[PDB]
């Protein structure tokens, strides 16, 4: 077949990255349940930003919510290692 044209492969790559974090969002939203109220405040604010970005397919929001949801995921991972 004809190979995918220009932006179509790039937008699909961004959607696959956002889809990967949303699979463990329910795990991470849970994982803040035994953590401090800041993490639980941050992830539910950051979670809807990723959820809307995937279904709206806006490039600006899908870029920002990818790095935003990655940031709180790093904070949770450092929280769970420091809490033991």
């Amino acid at each position: 077949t004809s190979l995918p044209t220009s932006n179509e492969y790039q937008n699909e790559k961004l959607a696959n990255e956002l889809k990967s974090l949303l699979d463990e969002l329910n795990v991470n939203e849970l994982a803040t349940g035994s953590l401090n109220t800041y993490y639980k405040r941050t992830i539910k604010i950051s979670g809807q930003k990723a959820m809307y970005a995937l279904k709206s397919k806006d490039f600006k929001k899908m870029s920002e919510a990818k790095y935003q949801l990655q940031k709180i995921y790093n904070e949770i991972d450092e929280a769970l290692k420091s809490k033991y």
């Binding site: 401090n36 109220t37 800041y38 639980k40 405040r41 539910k44 604010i45 979670g47 809807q48 809307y52 709206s56 420091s82």
Partner: protein, 47 residues
């Protein structure tokens, strides 16, 4: 919902508003660089 706004249920309110906090005690026993001990305290901020 489908509209371009955060839904109300997952809006998380700020509620920790005390004026004075961090009433803690610590001892400088870190390795003295030129006689100076460098202590790192990772602390939560408030709302």
């Amino acid at each position: 919902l489908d509209e371009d706004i955060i839904a109300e249920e997952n809006i998380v309110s700020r509620s920790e508003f005390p004026e004075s906090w961090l009433w803690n005690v610590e001892d400088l026993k870190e390795p003295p660089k030129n006689g100076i001990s460098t202590k790192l305290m990772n602390i939560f901020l408030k709302d």
